[PDB]
């Protein structure tokens, strides 16, 4: 075949997105409400969990790092200590921008000190009709005027969840993908606002004057306001009239603003391909049986996907570089980098255990409990437990 | 069925004119092998294994467990290849 790309990837020139794009995210993103509680809670779901950096045998990179010897994994460890954060950070971000993005830092002495993410609105890639970003262009505010720059596709690393193709090193933003979702569930809000406002609430008229009778005039009706005013009006009182005094009520014209709000919080979650449900809204029929199963399950599908998306960019564009270029361990040891899945349930691993651990490692069992392996290697290979091991013992 | 005859469909394509080619042009291994691709049910539940195995792991090897299981077989070829749990062969062996 051949050491390099021969199809073409569909642009070059220019717009296929702008800064301006990008600040509509952000925006969408600091006015708050439950358009941005939506697409947080999409990214607590698929990142909120937090992480662990497993490496595949460990063991074998056992090395001297300052008179002591150390494991990748826990160089790894004192290079990414909040890691839970920043993966929270990096897959939000990359969920409402259409990437995430960010540098890499050293310390006075010049070794590595953190891989240090940048504020993604700001940023924006140019590219070729090969399909590559080669360079990042950053525009700015300060003392509220504006600053401008280039930087390479060198010392920067991003990360996209959502794309176009294989081929895609731009990616998708779901909250441009469902502009008009987003723009119709505001709208339908303002509209239900003042409709509330309107016709909510019974307004109250009174009519002067009999029908065919004589006329009103308005300094007439000035006098009228000022018995019956609702400032001034109180929960007993009561109305002394001749017959030509009438007071009436515009009732709450009664409309289902329940059902309007349902469907828009229908249109909204399926739109993020959120369940229902995390939009505080239920349906009949729905919340028993295999279709409860089905809607997890597609929940589940949707996170391992994103979840795995994720770790393998971390781990090829983050970690191994940093491996690479500041470490004295090899950088193409398997990083395991896992996210957790918060559909998981402790409840199953426990049913599971017991269930059947005869045909289950130590390890494997601390494996899906979350803890670490016994500290004796035959015992944490082993099949049955430490405590059938430990009595055995005591009892010799 | 759709997501299974969807799933080898795509399977039998990858492995005749990705992987097979790939392993030809590349590899210093047979390419004309019996490679075997599988993608996974998504509406599998590991209960619903877990009642199984406790229900008929008499009938089943230590390897048709663990692979129904989604976990590596056992290390010794005739703990892996034997039906009676690797816990039972290890509890027997410390008493005997």
């Not at 952000?26 to 439950?34: A, L, P």
């Not at 990142?47 to 595949?56: D, K, Q, R, S, T």
């Not at 933003?173 to 406002?197: H, M």
């Not at 029929?285 to 979840?307: C, D, H, M, V």
Request: aromatic fraction near 6%.
């Amino acid at each position: 075949a051949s050491s390099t790309p021969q199809t073409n990837v569909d642009s070059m020139g220019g717009g296929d997105l702008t800064f301006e794009d990008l600040r509509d995210i952000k925006d969408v993103r600091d006015s708050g409400g439950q358009v941005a509680q939506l697409m947080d809670y999409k990214a607590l779901l698929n990142f909120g969990e937090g992480c662990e950096i497993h490496v595949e045998g460990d063991d074998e990179t056992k090395q001297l790092v300052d008179g002591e010897p150390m494991t990748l994994s826990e160089w790894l460890e004192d290079a990414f200590p909040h890691l839970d954060l920043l993966v929270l950070d990096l897959g939000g971000d990359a969920l409402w921008y259409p990437y995430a993005v960010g540098e890499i830092q050293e310390t006075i002495t010049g070794e590595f000190k953190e891989a240090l993410p940048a504020e993604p609105w700001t940023l924006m890639p140019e590219s070729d009709a090969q399909g590559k970003v080669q360079a990042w262009h950053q525009r700015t505010k300060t003392h509220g005027g504006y600053q401008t720059q280039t930087l390479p596709a060198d010392d920067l690393w991003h990360i996209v969840i959502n794309k176009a193709s294989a081929r895609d090193e731009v990616g998708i933003s779901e909250v441009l993908r469902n502009k008009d979702e987003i723009q119709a569930f505001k709208q339908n809000e303002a509209a239900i606002n003042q409709a509330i406002e309107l016709h909510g609430f019974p307004q109250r008229h009174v009519k002067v004057g009999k029908e065919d009778g004589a006329p009103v005039r308005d300094n007439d009706l000035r006098r009228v306001r000022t018995i019956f005013d609702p400032r001034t009006t109180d929960a007993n009182t009561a109305y002394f009239t001749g017959q030509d005094v009438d007071v009436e009520t515009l009732e709450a014209h009664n409309f289902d603003y329940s059902a309007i709000h349902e469907m828009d919080m229908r249109n909204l979650t399926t739109a993020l391909g959120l369940p229902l449900e995390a939009g505080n809204v239920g349906a009949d029929g729905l919340g028993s049986g295999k279709p409860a199963e089905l809607r997890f399950a597609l929940l589940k599908l949707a996170i391992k996907a994103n979840q795995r998306s994720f770790s393998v960019q971390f781990v090829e564009r983050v970690m191994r570089p940093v491996v690479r270029d500041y470490s004295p361990f090899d950088h193409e040891a398997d990083i395991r980098l896992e996210i957790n899945d918060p559909l998981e349930d402790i409840g199953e691993v426990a049913d599971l255990i017991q269930q059947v651990g005869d045909y289950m490692t130590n390890e494997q069992v601390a494996e899906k409990l979350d803890l670490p392996a016994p500290e004796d290697d035959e015992v944490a290979d082993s099949y049955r437990s430490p405590a059938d091991m430990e009595k055995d013992e005591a009892g010799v």
